[PDB]
Prior knowledge:
Distance between the termini of chain A: 10 Å
Oligomer: part of a larger assembly
Helix content of chain A: 40-55%
Strand content of chain A: 15-25%
Amino acid sequence: SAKDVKFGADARALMLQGVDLLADAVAVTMGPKGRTVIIEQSWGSPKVTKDGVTVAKSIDLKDKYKNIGAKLVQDVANNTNEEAGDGTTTATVLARSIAKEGFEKISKGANPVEIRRGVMLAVDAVIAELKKQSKPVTTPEEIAQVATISANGDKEIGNIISDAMKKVGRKGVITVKDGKTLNDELEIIEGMKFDRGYISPYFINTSKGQKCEFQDAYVLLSEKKISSIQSIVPALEIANAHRKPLVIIAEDVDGEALSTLVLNRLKVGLQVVAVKAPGFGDNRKNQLKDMAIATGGAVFGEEGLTLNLEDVQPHDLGKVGEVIVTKDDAMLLKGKGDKAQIEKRIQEIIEQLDVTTSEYEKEKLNERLAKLSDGVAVLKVGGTSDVEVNEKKDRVTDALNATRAAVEEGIVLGGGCALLRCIPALDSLTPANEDQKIGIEIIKRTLKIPAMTIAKNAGVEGSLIVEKIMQSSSEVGYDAMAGDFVNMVEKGIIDPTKVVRTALLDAAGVASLLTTAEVVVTEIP
Amino acid sequence: SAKDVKFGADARALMLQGVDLLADAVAVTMGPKGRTVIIEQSWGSPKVTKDGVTVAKSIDLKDKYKNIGAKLVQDVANNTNEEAGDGTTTATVLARSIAKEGFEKISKGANPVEIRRGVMLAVDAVIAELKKQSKPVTTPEEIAQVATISANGDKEIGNIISDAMKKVGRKGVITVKDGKTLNDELEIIEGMKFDRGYISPYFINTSKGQKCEFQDAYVLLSEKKISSIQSIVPALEIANAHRKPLVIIAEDVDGEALSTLVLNRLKVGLQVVAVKAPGFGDNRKNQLKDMAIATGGAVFGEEGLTLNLEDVQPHDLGKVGEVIVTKDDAMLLKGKGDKAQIEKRIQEIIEQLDVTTSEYEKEKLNERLAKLSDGVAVLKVGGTSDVEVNEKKDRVTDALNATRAAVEEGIVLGGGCALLRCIPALDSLTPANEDQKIGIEIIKRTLKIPAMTIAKNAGVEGSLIVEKIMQSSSEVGYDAMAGDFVNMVEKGIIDPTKVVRTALLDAAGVASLLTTAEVVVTEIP
Amino acid sequence: SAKDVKFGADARALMLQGVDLLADAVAVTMGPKGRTVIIEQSWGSPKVTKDGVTVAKSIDLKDKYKNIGAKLVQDVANNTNEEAGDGTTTATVLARSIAKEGFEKISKGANPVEIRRGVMLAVDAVIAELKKQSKPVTTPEEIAQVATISANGDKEIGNIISDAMKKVGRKGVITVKDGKTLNDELEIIEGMKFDRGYISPYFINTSKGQKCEFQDAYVLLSEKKISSIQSIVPALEIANAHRKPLVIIAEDVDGEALSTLVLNRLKVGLQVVAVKAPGFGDNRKNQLKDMAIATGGAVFGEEGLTLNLEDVQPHDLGKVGEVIVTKDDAMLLKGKGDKAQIEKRIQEIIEQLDVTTSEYEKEKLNERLAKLSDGVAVLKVGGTSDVEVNEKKDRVTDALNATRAAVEEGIVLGGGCALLRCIPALDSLTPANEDQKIGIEIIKRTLKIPAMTIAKNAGVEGSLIVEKIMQSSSEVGYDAMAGDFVNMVEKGIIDPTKVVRTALLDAAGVASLLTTAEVVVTEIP
Lengths: 525, 525, 525
């Protein structure tokens, strides 16, 4: 359709005036002293919350330029940074800052490209420094300590998380479930988790959970692509006759099959779901064989074995106690099949690993082995009442995610103090041109923004607090919870370094894109 | 959709405007001398009413900010507090005063978080004083006195209320019925009760009553969750063959089953409802077995006994005399089955209680025991005219609720004098900062507002009246009816303590939330 | 519908203003240091891109005159020049420059016809000069060098490209397929590609592929025109019995059959395609029978053999491994039939070439022979994951296209300097009149624009760079990537002369059209 286009600083000004509103809407909800936002519900009661992700994904500006700028920030910050709420807020605020100061410096009349080059050099140095000073954790004692810290000082939750980590391992997979009792219980059953999520966004079995959950389902495994391919009705025959739901795994589904399945879900709501193949090439075939054995079924590729989706049988397919699917992830638990066949497959994997030597091949064989040999820890979190156990499950999931990230990469000072400790690193940097120096100093200026915003949310004057922290030792920050400077790590105020690194990288990239954008095209209303 | 946003005081001002109109609208219907409101009906003659809850629930402003403020206040005010009409009104007025003066002080440059801290401290002191000062009720004579007081001087109402309460127990179940005669009389029968409301908000049998009722129904009990599960037809075939209605009790119902039931209710209006199980886990199954024995039915869980919803029989289900379903509550009376099995369940519960030692297990067994051993008292209130008996129904229900609240927590001086007796206790508190002192002073100022409003309703100058009351003893207050200073306790001008506590807490919470909110998001019209 | 008309300058100015928007919106992305552009997506996040083709295809002005100028410029530049990204942008910018200069010179009274004459003479001089100076490449070592250069220095890409080139030749056919492995692999297969595209624009099999994809198909070949003709459903009988898809080659398809098939494709999506015949007359028949032998089918011409579309047999037609159809091109590979048939057809083709003497007939026989005797190269690009192989495939396709374009017409200096080397050649030309002289001057002025724009995108002052370039030697240019003055050819910064020639021709023609247009008609809003 007809388009309205804006070029250069004129468009960048609109970009900035659009992003700043989002930045302010997300800043006040950061830190333990975060303020609150009230969200309009045109149909129900207003929603009050203190979640950065919610407010960030909520707002949507009226003007086209402002709207597209806000969406640019939103999509990257959310999709790329979603594990920790503080991470997305930090990325958003840092991006807003950097874009603004870069915009003013460009307006002064400098060269944007070298400004961005200096920005990238500064962020590289900051990341190197943060990696240097990020002390790791590899002990069960440290694991329990960090888990308890993520639980806001709660003990038993961190204890059970440490127990699970001990029983399974870091690469191990852990889940939660309603314990229907008075104490959270730890259990390990056979589980098969892989990194392919749902294929149909509209396919959400549980609206409240942003999740797809099924139990006691048969499975379909076929190497050949099943996109736009009919003759799945034979499967539907047993799916309707047998109350057991179904799960589909194929190379991909698109066109007629995807449309009919999703429309049936929307209207009829038949209990069948589909996902992508986990592996790649011969690795794909090996993994497919592995979990086909794990489920008692068979891969339904026509090459080699003679079997097709045109005909289905109750005993030809696999059986699984339950399969759960989500974004980018999906796992099945308590499969079926011959246990001797399982042992034979395990021996085959072992001998293949022993004979094989290549780093890639050995690593893939180890991953395949662990995918079946090791179990999945399910946290049967239990309590008195359904609402209470719901809240408890939310808390324990948050703690598990936080501790998993921390062990994955490490820990640095929380409370927005991690960045302030990297300030010395930039001094080692030197500029080839003045624009690079300006980029470096702009990064230096933005480094202190998270701490200042945390202070503002706490209500204390930001400048004094940040000056004190910078002048103070490299071991004590500022505690907004108690409004004083304390020994953070021992007091249990930290944040997984992975979150900080991701937030800084995303903010740098987004702000660089905004400050280097030259042409904007938008449709006339 | 496009969103409009406002920040800080700029948005809180519109919030204050929105709450102001609601507060002023509901203030005039406070106390015995409150005036009336003219609510408009687009179809028929306007109704004139003097009930705070009704007027509050009615209004809705135009501007998004004003409307959202009013709706926010009313939401908590009504939902949390819905027992005594004056409670919601006083909560709203208190919230208005707190928020107004807090915003006024914040505009000068106060610290919102410290102001909230001081406000919370003052509210804690006030509630502690109220708890220590409230006299309890633990005797049939005092129960009769307070009931007659709630009965507005009516004697027989208090007499029957006290008789029922002492006959069944201070914490037993109680209800009302139609006397179809000239004099109310009492009857106790086998009864069933549990704190669960109807799953379907729209599912109301009687529009007038706001309740759902059914007579001589059969029941369905399935520990299995029956959410999104078809094959409820086997219930429907005997529901239509036999004239008796049906009911389901299971873990939860949602999706296709809920949709078919709701569309049937809208179109067919079939006589079947479903609700949630009140118990939890082992408690859930034990309670389900108990009620199955009480009704002569059986739990339809698959484990153990082999029986599903696919096949049903008239004698496989339970039989009950009558069912009432309401908000947060549902009940069954005059169940069927083997009385020998009933005594067997009583004996097994008794021995389980004797062997058990855990406090929680003992309490749960006590609750389950009383859930069967003690019957349900019905107050069949009679008279001459249908209008007469309906007025008696409303009056007796109001008195019953008031006396239940009083016996649940106790009694304190009415006419709003209760809070005024808490004013001196504020001297005990000390402010860490000036902001906390300010907040305490704010609570002190607002503590007199209910008396202000009651006096204004009586038309007398409120400030002079409260000055006299505070300068006077801690036993004599002001009566609006007689328009003079009197001794309330023996003059029957009181109010249950629990209502005052709940209203004060909710008003404090909502006012703090309003005065602390920073950013507001609302969709553009 | 009513129409509005404008004359002379009062319309040329409107069209020039319109084209200015597109020219500026596409100038920035030119060059390796091209900036980005924000494209609005009405449903998803705004698209960020740095590709001239996309932005040029995207924008659409509002005013009819400006809109039509932009539309004609984009249409000619894109459709006439679409092989390389930079060619279209160069065409657009050069056209805008010359159009503006010519409009300015006409404004003072210059004769547009003679201005155009001089412009075309200058274009002829420059094209002759660059063709003279175009250094060629025909050696496998040079092929690998240029392929790596196009591959951004990637070595294995150039290696595999050179291997395929050697094994299949300059005029042979090469495509790239998914490797499903960890290393790109090469093989030669029997193929049959001709220069006819899909008849149906709405017949894009793969939405993302911008192409038609089909596999393991049969073919219908009919000499007769099958436009508007029914009775193809007999083929659909086996096309539905066998899930095998079908392809058709006839003289043309239009009217009844075309509408029916496009409807069935839009709604039913049946797996059948048709395309036009590649040859002409006796050549058409010869190619059709050659490919019928290649596939084992038969041409359905009614004369001679008695076979019709009315009657079909699964074995009557030919079988082919894969069906790929795209714009202006379609290839069929892995045909079936009798290899003795292939051998005897090749033998008789060889004998016909031996006996024939006409050069046109000789070359037609040569291409017909090569159609079958030699195979087609398919590159099995591989990798770890689907996204990785997708990116690798895109890069390999781009590199293959660039190297083919270079090898077919040699190479010239990259970075836009190639034109700058041709400035002296304009000294030879002598214009008959002063208007032709002004045209020569205009072309001299515009010849410097592309390098100027690349420099501006790099941020360096373009005028200084171009003045140095023209004052420097004939072997050294400026690299924006390194921001220095380097010898381009061995620095791996070059561009095929075909792109330069096509862009220059199209730009000159479009600008001549714009400078000569006298009357513009537009529909009333």
